[PDB]
Structure 1
Amino acid sequence: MVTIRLARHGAKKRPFYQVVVADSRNARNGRFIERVGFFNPIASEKEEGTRLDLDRIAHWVGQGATISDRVAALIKEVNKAA
């Protein structure tokens, strides 16, 4: 099925996660359908560090896609503060 998940990138011990509407069979860093936002867990906290696209995630959940554990938490947390 179609999912919404984090692909890892970044250097070693300093990850960085793109957020990617994939088919679930494809490998983590491989073939995605869309990119939708990002997530930096090492961020400075004076300067962004997470940005989802809530308008295009809600579209893909419409058409009937899953979400991860993490991408769920990131949606909960980017609707509290913003």
Structure 2
Amino acid sequence: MVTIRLARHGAKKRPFYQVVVADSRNARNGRFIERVGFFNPIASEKEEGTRLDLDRIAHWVGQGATISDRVAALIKEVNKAA
């Protein structure tokens, strides 16, 4: 299935996850269709700890993309009732 999932792209002990849409069969850091946004688990003063293109996530959910547990959690954190 098409999945909207995280891809670990950071350095050692400091991960930086790219929230990305990809086929489920591909590797974690491999081929993807489009890049929705990002999420840094390392906490900071910035409001860009997580950024998501919710329009693209809605478009792919309508197309049939499934959402991972971490992506659903990040969508619950990045909403109108934040």
* Pairwise TM-score range, normalised by the shorter structure: over 0.9
Structure 1 unaligned residues grouped into runs of 5+: none
CA shift, 1:43, in A, is 2.9
Bigger drift between 11-20 and 43-52 goes to 43-52
**TM-score, normalised with respect to structure 1:** 0.93
| Higher strand proportion (structure 1 or 2) | 2
Secondary structure of the 1:26 match is coil
SS for the counterpart of 2:78 is: helix
Superposed, 1:53-68 pairs within 5 Å as: 53-68=53-68
Shift >2 Å, 4+ stretches: none
Output the aligned Cα RMSD: 1.3
Distance in structure 2 (CA, Å) of the matches to 1:31 and 1:7: 10
More displaced stretch, 38-47 vs 63-72: 38-47
* 1:12 Cα offset (Å): 0.2
TM (norm. structure 2) is: 0.93
SS at 1:41 equivalent: coil
Stretches of structure 2 lacking an aligned partner (at least 5 in a row): none
Pick which of 41-50 and 64-73 moved more: 41-50
